Amino acid sequence: LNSINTNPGALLALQNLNSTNTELAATQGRINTGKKVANAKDNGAIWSMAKMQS
Amino acid sequence: LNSINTNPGALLALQNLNSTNTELAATQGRINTGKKVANAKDNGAIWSMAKMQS
């Protein structure tokens, strides 16, 4: 709690900020690609379906 | 929907414009030859009949 050696609350705020940064990066990729499924990591089944479809 | 990668509506407008261009080409052909069936592609039975009678 009142420790100089560590502070858990900063670690939790860091986890929250990293979650926000990851969601922002995903939104950046969806904007710059124009696809919600741009590659196999987005969704492998729908991606393979679209590959055979195209 | 609101995609940048593709749009159905221009495709539908294009197939409609292509149908209009095809009808205009058929009209130009009927105008410049003066016959509703100028060749075997127009109507094979009527064309065979008219050619044997001619």
What amino acid occupies position B44? G
Task: Judge whether B4 is closer than 8 Å to chain A, CB to CB.
Answer: yes
Cβ partners under 8 Å of residue A34, min gap 6: B3, B4, B5
Element (H, E) at A28: helix A8-33
Chain B contact for A35 (CB, 8 A cutoff): yes
Rounded CA-CA distance B12/B31 in Å is 29
A36 touching B, CB under 8 A?
no
DSSP B51: H
What is the stated resolution of the deposited model, in angstroms?
Answer: 2.5
Please name the method used to determine this structure.
cryo-EM
Tell me which DSSP letter residue B39 carries: S
Residues in chain A closer than 8 A to B5 (CB atoms): 34-35
Chain breaks after residues in chain A, where C lies over 2.5 Å from next N: none
- Residues with Cβ within 8 Å of B38's Cβ and at least 6 positions away in sequence, in order, are B29, B30
Contact at 8 Å (CB) between B47 and B40? yes
Cα atoms in the 13 Å half-sphere on the side-chain side of B21 = 6
Contacts of A40 (CB under 8 A, 6+ apart): A47, A48
